[PDB]
Amino acid sequence: GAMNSSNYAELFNNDIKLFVDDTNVYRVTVHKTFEGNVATKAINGCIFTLNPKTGHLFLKIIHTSVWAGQKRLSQLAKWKTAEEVSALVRSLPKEEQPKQIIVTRKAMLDPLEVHMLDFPNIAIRPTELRLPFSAAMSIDKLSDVVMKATEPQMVLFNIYDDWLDRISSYTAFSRLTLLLRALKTNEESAKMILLSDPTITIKSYHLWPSFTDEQWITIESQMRDLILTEYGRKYNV
Amino acid sequence: MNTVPFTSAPIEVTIGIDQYSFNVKENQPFHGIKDIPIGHVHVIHFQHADNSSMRYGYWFDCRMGNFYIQYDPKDGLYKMMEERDGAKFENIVHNFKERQMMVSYPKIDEDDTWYNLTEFVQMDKIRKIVRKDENQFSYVDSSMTTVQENELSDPAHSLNYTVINFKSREAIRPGHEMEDFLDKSYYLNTVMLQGIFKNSSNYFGELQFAFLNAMFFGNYGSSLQWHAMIELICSSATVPKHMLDKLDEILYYQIKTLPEQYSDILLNERVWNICLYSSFQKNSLHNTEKIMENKYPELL
Numbered sequence: 271g272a273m274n275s276s277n278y279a280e281l282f283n284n285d286i287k288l289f290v291d292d293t294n295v296y297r298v299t300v301h302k303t304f305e306g307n308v309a310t311k312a313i314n315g316c317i318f319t320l321n322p323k324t325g326h327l328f329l330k331i332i333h334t335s336v337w338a339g340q341k342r343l344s345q346l347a348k349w350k351t352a353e354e355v356s357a358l359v360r361s362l363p364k365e366e367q368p369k370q371i372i373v374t375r376k377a378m379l380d381p382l383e384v385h386m387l388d389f390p391n392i393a394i395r396p397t398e399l400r401l402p403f404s405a406a407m408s409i410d411k412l413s414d415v416v417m418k419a420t421e422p423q424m425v426l427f428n429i430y431d432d433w434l435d436r437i438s439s440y441t442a443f444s445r446l447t448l449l450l451r452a453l454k455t456n457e458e459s460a461k462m463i464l465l466s467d468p469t470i471t472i473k474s475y476h477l478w479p480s481f482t483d484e485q486w487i488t489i490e491s492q493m494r495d496l497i498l499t500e501y502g503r504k505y506n507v
Numbered sequence: 508m509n510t511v512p513f514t515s516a517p518i519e520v521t522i523g524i525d526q527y528s529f530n531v532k533e534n535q536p537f538h539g540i541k542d543i544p545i546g547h548v549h550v551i552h553f554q555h556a557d558n559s560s561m562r563y564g565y566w567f568d569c570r571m572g573n574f575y576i577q578y579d580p581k582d583g584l585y586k587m588m589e590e591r592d593g594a595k596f597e598n599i600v601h602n603f604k605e606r607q608m609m610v611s612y613p614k615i616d617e618d619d620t621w622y623n624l625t626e627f628v629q630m631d632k633i634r635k636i637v638r639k640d641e642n643q644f645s646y647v648d649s650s651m652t653t654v655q656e657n658e659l660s661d662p663a664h665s666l667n668y669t670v671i672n673f674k675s676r677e678a679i680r681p682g683h684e685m686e687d688f689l690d691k692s693y694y695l696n697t698v699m700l701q702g703i704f705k706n707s708s709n710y711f712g713e714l715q716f717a718f719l720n721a722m723f724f725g726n727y728g729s730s731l732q733w734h735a736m737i738e739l740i741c742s743s744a745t746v747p748k749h750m751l752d753k754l755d756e757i758l759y760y761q762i763k764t765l766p767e768q769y770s771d772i773l774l775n776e777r778v779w780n781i782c783l784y785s786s787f788q789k790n791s792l793h794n795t796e797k798i799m800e801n802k803y804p805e806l807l
């Protein structure tokens with residue numbers, strides 16, 4: 271059924287699974303027309319498809335061309351997401367295909383079930399977890415490859431960098447969700463905390479800075495405080 | 508003009524004949540039902556006074572043979588049987604008629620209700636849904652499961668309705684996933700109408716048979732089938748005008764006939780709200796929308 275707080279260790283077992291987040295697939299700027307009406311302009315988006323055990327991120331870039339001449343784009347975006355996830359599964363050798371696909375939004379369930387009818391042994395599941403994967407576009411290198419794309423493209427990242435050399439998947443996912451929650455709540459503040467010390471850099475092949483174990487504890491502390499700082503500033507507490 | 512005689516009525520029972528019903532007492536001098544209109548299928552149905560779990564009956568057509576009811580004290584039910592000796596049967600019916608031990612099928616001359624509910628229902632189609640090919644009549648009861656209910660037990664005692672499943676490879680063409688899921692026209696017109704039913708008459712016949720089994724027996728699988736067949740039409744952008752006009756008449760009579768006190772258990776709030784107010788055909792079912800709004804505004 272539904273992924274929740276009660277069945278959270280399941281993310282880190284040896285059954286291959288993927289999270290799919292469709293938040294950033296269909297993205298628009300809203301603007302005034304010469305006649306003072308309102309119009310949208312689409313900008314490039316992405317599907318966020320993540321193996322929470324390995325950190326493998328299948329980022330399918332959604333180029334604005336896929337919307338040309340189409341109607342009901344927020345509905346089409348769910349079906350295009352399900353089409354591309356289905357295409358990805360079909361591209362993987364059988365032994366790499368997921369046993370479960372967890373969608374971050376319940377509106378993705380029927381589109382993905384319908385595209386995956388061919389795969390009756392792949393469970394399509396919702397989650398009670400409120401995951402901050404919308405904030406993927408706050409990761410500078412992911413934002414950059416999406417906005418520079420001139421055509422449909424799949425880009426592969428490890429969202430955990432080399433963390434799994436030193437920590438478990440459970441800990442890596444916890445760090446990722448805390449970083450993304452912070453970037454979602456106050457992007458400027460989160461980015462200052464990550465990047466304010468120029469001596470700690472981002473390796474060319476990484477997304478996040480090269481923090482020592484001790485430095486990750488400080489960073490993690492600053493992020494939890496930002497989320498409480500902003501929760502105070504928000505609720506006046 | 509046709510007659511279904513009863514050997515006797517040894518147990519107190521409510522007897523249904525089509526949309527009519529009456530109470531018979533334990534050992535009451537009752538020998539059956541006369542003046543049954545030729546030209547239509549009929550259903551004779553039973554609910555024991557001592558045990559309302561016993562809700563069961565027989566679909567028949569008097570043109571297909573001479574049928575009678577006889578209580579089986581071993582199996583504890585009223586059984587339909589065929590009498591192959593025409594002369595004997597004619598002699599029995601004549602005696603019971605002379606002695607006025609039969610009830611008359613109480614049809615009002617103005618009254619097209621039963622035709623309107625059974626217009627497309629054929630005894631040969633019923634016999635394919637209910638398999639017991641050594642009898643010309645078909646037994647149905649409240650607990651019989653459908654082939655679909657048995658895929659989500661006993662195959663011999665099941666209702667073989669056409670399986671409708673909106674999230675099946677049958678319903679969805681490769682490369683047409685969104686189109687086919689959001690507009691069921693392919694599934695209705697190519698798979699079901701052209702492919703399985705051959706024509707809208709056979710489709711309506713099954714739809715009407717499912718309703719009647721839902722209403723007369725409280726058969727849950729039948730109620731699921733009736734709603735799936737309505738939803739498949741209402742969820743199709745492209746439906747022949749004659750099929751929509753006929754469906755409106757079919758549903759109108761079904762909603763008119765449904766007992767008010769069963770509306771809550773026999774009508775699916777989600778399907779009716781979607782069909783009348785959100786679907787492609789939301790503006791196509793004028794008669795049905797008007798009777799539903801005036802009779803069951805609480806459901807909507």
Ligand SMILES: O=C(NCCc1cccs1)c1ccncc1
Nearest residue numbers: 530531536537606607608609610
């Ligand atoms: O009242 C009678 N007709 C039975 C029909 C019914 C069966 C059960 C309720 S009324 C009857 C009584 C005396 N002589 C002939 C017939």
